[PDB]
Design a protein around this nucleic acid. Sequence first.
RNA 1: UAAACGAUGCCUACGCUGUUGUGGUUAUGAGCACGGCAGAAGAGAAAUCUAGUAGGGCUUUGGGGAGAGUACGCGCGCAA
Lengths: 101, 119, 226, 65, 128, 119, 220
Amino acid sequence: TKKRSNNGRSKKNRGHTRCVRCEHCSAMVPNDKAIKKFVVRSVIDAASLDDLKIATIYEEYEVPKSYYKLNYCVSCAVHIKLVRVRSRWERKIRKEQRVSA
Amino acid sequence: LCPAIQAEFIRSKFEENIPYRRSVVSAIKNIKSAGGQGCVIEVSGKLKGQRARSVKTIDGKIIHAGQPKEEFMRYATTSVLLKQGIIGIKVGIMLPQDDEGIKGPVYDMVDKIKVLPIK
Amino acid sequence: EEAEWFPKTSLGKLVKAGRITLDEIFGHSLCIREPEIIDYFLKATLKEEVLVIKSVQKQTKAGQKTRMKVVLALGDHNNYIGIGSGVARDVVSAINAAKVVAKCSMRPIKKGFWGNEIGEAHTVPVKALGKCGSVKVQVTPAPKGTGLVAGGVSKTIFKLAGIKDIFTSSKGQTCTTENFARASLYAITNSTNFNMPNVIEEKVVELNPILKNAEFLIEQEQRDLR
Amino acid sequence: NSFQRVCDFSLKPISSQDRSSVQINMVQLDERGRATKDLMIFNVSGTVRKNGKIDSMLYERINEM
Amino acid sequence: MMDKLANLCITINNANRAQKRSVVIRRISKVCRLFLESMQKHGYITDIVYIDDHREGKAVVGLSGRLNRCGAICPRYDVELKDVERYRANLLPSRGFGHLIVTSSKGLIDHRECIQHNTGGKILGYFY
Amino acid sequence: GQIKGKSVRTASKVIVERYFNRLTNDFYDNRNVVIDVAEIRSKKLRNKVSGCVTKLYKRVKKNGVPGLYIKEHEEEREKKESFIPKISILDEDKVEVDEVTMEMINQYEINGDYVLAKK
Amino acid sequence: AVRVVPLSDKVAKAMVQCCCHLGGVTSSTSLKEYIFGKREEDKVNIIDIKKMWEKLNLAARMICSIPNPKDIVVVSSKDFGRKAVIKFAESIGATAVTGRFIPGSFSNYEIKGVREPRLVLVSDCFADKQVVKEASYVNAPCIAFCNTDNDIEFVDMVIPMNNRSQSAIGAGFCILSKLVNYMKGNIDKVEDKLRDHIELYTYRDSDELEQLYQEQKIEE
RNA sequence: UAAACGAUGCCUACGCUGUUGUGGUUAUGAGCACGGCAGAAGAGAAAUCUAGUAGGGCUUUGGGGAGAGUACGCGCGCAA
Ligand SMILES: [Zn+2]
């Protein structure tokens, strides 16, 4: 029986879409189906900022950040616990997740 | 209110070759009609074939735990010999409360609370 | 040994006091929520027939738990019919339960003539259809003196409803006795409510009898209190 | 008799089984806007009630009167 | 394109179910007029106005509380006077009321008038 | 875990509604009253009932417990209501209000000292 | 036209101060007929006064039609709107329900203390949804006060008014009480007792009542 | 030749509400074409709804599992 109204993907009014590759296992997954995750990570760890304050030559310094978008296939997303199995009424709830660091 | 009588009514009916169901249903009616506030009956053995089972029936109120079981509850056990083996019978009855102390205890259970009516 | 009836509901007060008739009840579409109301008027006349007994099962860790399900009809051979189902550990208990449902769902059934209006009305007025689950039943009027052309279960229902001639057709899985019984009762019911050409002129209007008798009931309020 | 109840808003008979049918009663205004012993009476089916359509329909008919 | 006599029927059937009292019907032909005029003679509909819009045509009609159902038959079968009662028993709910309409050399007539005039014709539609 | 259990809270709630005026802020008064009125067969229970009742009586006399109607405090709340507010919208006869309301005032010709909202 | 007990100037003034006419921002196809324009500054919809008086009169009329007034049941399951019901019902002889309406309490005989209704009254019927639903089982009409954001299936008489402010709730109940009494001849003019009653009904915090107590006692 | 799938033929009808898009036009109130979403009422064995109402027109197509989309003949293809 049909488990989801949208077939588990975001394609509508189209024939075909570009593929992308999974970060964890390099499998091909369609772009409109892949699980997506955003990361904004400081170059320097929080446990070093108190040393940075005496190491730097400049009057003040702003740490550089690094930015990423990651893609996962279903198997990897479930195994890494980005997503979890949910009850028949919970399946319908849609909410934006946090940006990781 | 005597489980030792009722169990022998049951044992009789097995030898009379009457179904356990009909026999037990009659026993429970007699126990309840005589004023017992509940009872338990179990039959166990080679009762309907080569595979043995036990069938247990409950009606009304029965107490299992603590000192209130020693004063309100009465039990009997018997067995009947048949061509295929021995069939065992257990009967338990919970006595009614009785203010003159003949049929059961004078004082009702220790955990029951009753609040008096206002004038 | 018997128990006297104290009416739980407002309409119940009126029937016991003797201020109302069974046609007035049906005519105003009043709820029935006390079986005693039907007993009061029809106890001396009601017949019943058991349509089906069957055993149902629930699987558990210990094994199958099981119960008896019974379905029956109450009716008077003149005007009234109702259908009821009950489930219990015992076939007797199940019958007691089913009877309550039946009484709380009695209906009056209208009748008519195949041709001209000579003699007494004897068939359903108009060709009609009733559906329940996968089962569909259609009833058609019939000439006087044809009898009940009807299948096993539905035949009993027409007889209790006081119908003398009918033609019937059926579609679907009629082995399911509950569906076949409910569908046929809907078919006759639908025929009684058909919008006949005369209906608009036959119309009458009245105030609801519970509003009409408010004064008496207010006395009964004070009588119970005092 | 048992077969003489007809719905005012939808012009069809009401069956004995319909739990959602209701009868609405209202008094008539007196001279100088007070009350009287005479009553308006309406019989209304369940079908209109499940839809929600009764609100507007009644307002229409009090105007018709 | 849809058949105009079919369109007429579905338009009034749905509006009746939705408990409306009046409708506008959007494409009209000569036999559609005669069909509506038949329903007026037997008191199934009350008021008729025709709009002369120069684009086909359209009608506005008032429904009575007496109308349960109507319908067109397609195709329009030819029938002898011997055949009409077969169709009468198939379409109508009761022997006492309702109308089956037939086209003839004497206009639209009902299944009773067929006996009076002694004529078959072609089957057109029904209402009750 | 020191939770009171169902019969103890039930008897507590009933006694405060049935005999409210007889009770006080004092454990020993309350223990005397439950010793007097109740059927309770062990001091172990009535120590717990009078404990909960004197725990309620503070909260109840301190402007009420929701879910616990006492006629004495329905009267106290009627006294607090009979201590009527002397605040007034009633003297605010001069007013300013929006244009849409001023046109409703016009279309129904409503007399009074209204103004357009100066805003 | 509909025969309605005449408007009087102080009454008109009263309702406007009580902010009866301030609707919400949303609207519904059922309620379009009662709106007369929208605030350019605020997007708030403004209610038509003449129509408000009409349906208020219509409600009053049918309240008079039912003998033994105890059979009228008034419900309002919220603080911020509680005390109004408690006084209002006494002014007409009706019964009332105050807390949570126990579901099944009209349907089921075993739940004690609420009478079989012959007419149900509700304020702010987003709450008390159960009451509107349950009355439908027992052939009772329903009268509700309502606002443009919300819409109901089984309500027969929808009186339009603000229901989200303690100023407003008082005004509706206070006025309707008087009309019902007037229609029966229990009072001779409606302007008789404005600021007394409309204040009595109006909700107040414990914190206010402390201040008012101290004031009153100083004055005494 | 494909799980060439929204597993839902093509024209043409009659049909409840709220919300959100894309492109033009606008008495600025709205419309027309192409969509998404959330209820309702009906429907259906249910799950659910491209599935509501209906003798409108025309084509394809199924008739308990298996053997079998296999044998023989024929048509296309370099073969597969
Ligand atoms: Zn992967």
